[PDB]
Amino acid sequence: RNRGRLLCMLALTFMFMVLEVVVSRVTSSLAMLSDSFHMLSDVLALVVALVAERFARRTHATQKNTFGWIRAEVMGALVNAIFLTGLCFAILLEAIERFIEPHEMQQPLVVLGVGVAGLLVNVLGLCLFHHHAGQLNMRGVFLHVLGDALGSVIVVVNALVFYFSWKGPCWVLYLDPTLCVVMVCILLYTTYPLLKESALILLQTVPKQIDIRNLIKELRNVEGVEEVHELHVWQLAGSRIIATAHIKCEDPTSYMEVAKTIKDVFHNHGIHATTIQPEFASVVPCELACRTQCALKQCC
Amino acid sequence: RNRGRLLCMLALTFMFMVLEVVVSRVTSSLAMLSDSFHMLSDVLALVVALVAERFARRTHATQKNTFGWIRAEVMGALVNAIFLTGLCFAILLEAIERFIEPHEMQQPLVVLGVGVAGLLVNVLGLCLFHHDRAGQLNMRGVFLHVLGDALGSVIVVVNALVFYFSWKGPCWVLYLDPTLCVVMVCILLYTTYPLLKESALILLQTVPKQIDIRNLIKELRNVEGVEEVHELHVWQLAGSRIIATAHIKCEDPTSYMEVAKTIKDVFHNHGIHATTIQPEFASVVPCELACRTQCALKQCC
Numbered sequence: 231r232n233r234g235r236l237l238c239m240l241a242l243t244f245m246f247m248v249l250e251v252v253v254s255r256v257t258s259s260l261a262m263l264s265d266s267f268h269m270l271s272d273v274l275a276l277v278v279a280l281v282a283e284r285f286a287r288r289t290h291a292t293q294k295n296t297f298g299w300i301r302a303e304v305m306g307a308l309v310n311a312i313f314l315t316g317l318c319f320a321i322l323l324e325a326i327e328r329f330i331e332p333h334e335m336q337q338p339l340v341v342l343g344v345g346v347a348g349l350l351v352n353v354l355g356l357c358l359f360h361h362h363a364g365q366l367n368m369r370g371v372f373l374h375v376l377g378d379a380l381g382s383v384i385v386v387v388n389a390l391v392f393y394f395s396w397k398g399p400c401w402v403l404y405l406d407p408t409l410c411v412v413m414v415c416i417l418l419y420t421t422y423p424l425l426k427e428s429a430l431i432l433l434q435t436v437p438k439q440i441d442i443r444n445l446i447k448e449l450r451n452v453e454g455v456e457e458v459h460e461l462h463v464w465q466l467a468g469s470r471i472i473a474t475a476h477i478k479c480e481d482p483t484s485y486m487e488v489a490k491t492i493k494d495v496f497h498n499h500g501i502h503a504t505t506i507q508p509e510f511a512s513v514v515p516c517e518l519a520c521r522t523q524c525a526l527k528q529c530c
Numbered sequence: 531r532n533r534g535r536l537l538c539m540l541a542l543t544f545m546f547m548v549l550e551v552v553v554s555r556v557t558s559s560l561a562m563l564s565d566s567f568h569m570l571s572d573v574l575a576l577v578v579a580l581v582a583e584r585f586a587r588r589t590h591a592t593q594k595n596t597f598g599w600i601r602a603e604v605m606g607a608l609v610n611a612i613f614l615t616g617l618c619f620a621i622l623l624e625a626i627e628r629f630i631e632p633h634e635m636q637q638p639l640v641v642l643g644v645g646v647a648g649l650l651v652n653v654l655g656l657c658l659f660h661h662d663r664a665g666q667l668n669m670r671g672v673f674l675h676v677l678g679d680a681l682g683s684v685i686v687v688v689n690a691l692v693f694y695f696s697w698k699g700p701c702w703v704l705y706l707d708p709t710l711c712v713v714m715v716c717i718l719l720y721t722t723y724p725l726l727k728e729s730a731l732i733l734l735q736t737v738p739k740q741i742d743i744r745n746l747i748k749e750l751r752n753v754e755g756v757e758e759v760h761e762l763h764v765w766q767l768a769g770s771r772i773i774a775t776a777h778i779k780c781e782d783p784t785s786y787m788e789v790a791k792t793i794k795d796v797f798h799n800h801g802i803h804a805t806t807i808q809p810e811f812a813s814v815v816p817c818e819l820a821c822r823t824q825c826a827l828k829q830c831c
């Protein structure tokens with residue numbers, strides 16, 4: 231389903247770019263012809279989303295990657311968030327430039343028509359991506375489409391203002407940069423949670439719904455286990471959470487009695503992919519340690 | 531010293547921005563002001579590396595992150611690579627626009643002076659970022675960004691010389707800048723693709739290139755204690771820190787610890803030291819310890 235939405239959006243973007251080039255060649259406008267090439271950024275964003283979605287379905291172990299490419303959509307969401315942040319910074323800088331030196335728009339009616347067409351295309355994109363793991367990439371595309379829609383609304387309003395008012399001509403020239411600044415603020419406000427979540431997923435951060443202190447406290451509550459060390463909890467993608475710990479039991483015969491208990495304790499929380507390594511005999515913190523232990527070759 | 535390196539580079543970037551602003555104000559040319567305000571891309575590129583370097587020295591286990599923030603350097607390298615690729619694509623679009631309609635600068639002399647100052651700053655940056663593995667990645671990203679800046683400065687200096695010595699006015703001189711810009715973006719994309727690939731692979735839990743999964747599992751199954759090995763997950767955290775987890779089946783819990791020493795030694799022969807091996811003592815039974823409500827969306831691989 232997601233691939234169809236992305237392909238339809240890509241087709242719409244290409245059609246709109248063709249329309250903009252054609253209308254520029256008819257109207258002999260070089261400025262909006264150059265503006266038409268600015269949709270290659272949205273084409274690239276859609277291509278990145280498509281690649282991430284295509285690779286996210288290879289959820290099988292591979293000689294190159296043991297987990298499969300389940301982390302592809304989260305990577306694509308991070309890339310799209312970074313690209314959108316860069317675009318927001320660039321258009322904020324451009325708005326500052328227009329503040330410093332004002333810009334006059336030529337042919338308001340053609341620009342208004344192109345803006346209405348772009349707004350309709352972006353509304354179709356929003357109706358494609360209104361969302362009714364994989365949600366990260368989809369919301370990354372949705373934020374870019376929403377930014378495009380806001381830009382289209384701004385340019386339509388700007389064209390209407392020049393056509394209706396421009397021949398107080400002084401304040402009219404400054405309506406575009408302030409609206410662009412407001413749109414940058416809104417876009418960054420909506421994009422920061424997505425970028426934060428993606429970056430915190432790529433880093434091996436504990437998911438926000440799991441507290442390590444409580445998990446450790448319940449882990450020591452099992453009768454067989456004596457102490458828990460080297461506890462690593464991280465999120466692969468979506469609800470795929472992997473937990474790893476070392477335990478001391480001092481009773482290999484009843485290990486399955488307490489291994490199932492530890493599995494149940496992990497299963498009570500949103501953890502189902504675990505790997506618990508027992509150790510049997512306190513000078514050494516961990517019996518199974520490397521012969522030449524180095525801080526540069528071990529986790530944490 | 532790495533942090534002081536980035537502080538020195540940031541200070542030089544800021545003072546060159548101030549110099550560009552002053553030159554714009556005295557010269558009363560808006561192009562210099564526009565360039566000075568566009569130069570903030572390097573300020574953000576250095577700030578990202580500084581943040582990553584500061585945050586990745588916290589290798590201790592944190593409440594929010596049990597592995598520490600040692601992956602922050604690789605994250606910063608990836609962010610710098612993506613930012614550089616975006617800047618390259620923007621440069622390519624600008625070159626296309628210049629090809630469609632050319633641009634002529636008003637005063638070659640001021641452009642030449644500003645470009646010479648920027649070229650000196652950038653060659654100092656290269657001499658400064660001349661050079662663990664994760665530390666190299668962030669340094670590699672900033673070095674590539676400074677190299678792209680230096681190539682841009684060389685291009686602008688050469689182009690300014692060409693206008694000052696040739697233009698009075700051939701047609702080809704107006705198109706000298708886009709050709710050099712295209713060459714620059716080609717070279718910079720070629721030299722930044724390996725960094726982006728390496729960073730993205732590291733964050734995608736890719737097996738390090740020096741580990742063969744088939745050989746590893748064949749060696750693991752070769753020891754006497756184990757009966758079979760299933761769900762062998764191997765991934766690289768950052769630099770030379772590789773974590774490998776596996777599930778094994780032993781003959782009996784008695785004398786299991788000898789099997790664990792042998793498996794640890796087998797992993798230690800390869801570049802893996804931070805391991806975790808879960809024995810599964812005794813239907814097909816792929817894994818004795820499995821969740822009751824098995825789901826493909828709630829499990830690794």
Ligand SMILES: CC(C)CCC[C@@H](C)[C@H]1CC[C@H]2[C@@H]3CC=C4C[C@@H](OC(=O)CCC(=O)O)CC[C@]4(C)[C@H]3CC[C@]12C
Nearest residue numbers: 312313315316425574575577578581585609610612613
């Ligand atoms: C397009 C690319 C090249 C750049 C993307 C923007 C970055 C420059 C931004 C995005 C999110 C930012 C981070 C968001 C949150 C924080 C936590 C912040 O921690 C604090 O000190 C918070 C205050 C406190 O705890 O006292 C330090 C800056 C940092 C890492 C920020 C550093 C700058 C970042 C990486």
Ligand SMILES: CC(C)CCC[C@@H](C)[C@H]1CC[C@H]2[C@@H]3CC=C4C[C@@H](OC(=O)CCC(=O)O)CC[C@]4(C)[C@H]3CC[C@]12C
Nearest residue numbers: 319322411412414415416417418419420421422423426
């Ligand atoms: C003169 C201005 C227009 C230039 C600088 C613009 C941006 C660099 C700033 C302006 C307001 C900032 C935002 C103000 C508030 C927040 C909320 C906060 O993130 C959250 O969403 C946390 C929860 C919350 O505050 O509701 C911190 C980031 C963010 C988006 C900030 C991101 C950076 C922004 C967009």
Ligand SMILES: CC(C)CCC[C@@H](C)[C@H]1CC[C@H]2[C@@H]3CC=C4C[C@@H](OC(=O)CCC(=O)O)CC[C@]4(C)[C@H]3CC[C@]12C
Nearest residue numbers: 274275277278281309310313612613615616619726727
């Ligand atoms: C928004 C921008 C700035 C993001 C960064 C640029 C991306 C558009 C590029 C950077 C690396 C590229 C990837 C590099 C490697 C590959 C592998 C390639 O697959 C193969 O190697 C096929 C081999 C074969 O069988 O012939 C498919 C394209 C892809 C995913 C590329 C897709 C486009 C990517 C993500």
Ligand SMILES: CC(C)CCC[C@@H](C)[C@H]1CC[C@H]2[C@@H]3CC=C4C[C@@H](OC(=O)CCC(=O)O)CC[C@]4(C)[C@H]3CC[C@]12C
Nearest residue numbers: 622625626629712713715716717718719720721723724
């Ligand atoms: C207006 C016209 C003249 C513009 C022409 C632009 C091209 C000459 C540029 C644009 C993007 C460049 C590509 C960007 C990224 C890469 C990846 C880089 O890494 C590899 O793929 C390794 C070599 C290989 O595996 O083939 C090789 C160069 C290449 C294909 C570049 C080749 C030259 C390209 C196609």
Ligand SMILES: [Zn+2]
Nearest residue numbers: 271272374378
């Ligand atoms: Zn867009």
Ligand SMILES: [Zn+2]
Nearest residue numbers: 497501502821
């Ligand atoms: Zn479970």
Ligand SMILES: [Zn+2]
Nearest residue numbers: 460476516517
């Ligand atoms: Zn241990």
Ligand SMILES: [Zn+2]
Nearest residue numbers: 460528529530
């Ligand atoms: Zn550890």
Ligand SMILES: [Zn+2]
Nearest residue numbers: 572675676679
């Ligand atoms: Zn730079």
Ligand SMILES: [Zn+2]
Nearest residue numbers: 777778810817
């Ligand atoms: Zn198992």
Ligand SMILES: [Zn+2]
Nearest residue numbers: 520798802803
């Ligand atoms: Zn070892």
Ligand SMILES: [Zn+2]
Nearest residue numbers: 761763830831
């Ligand atoms: Zn698995």
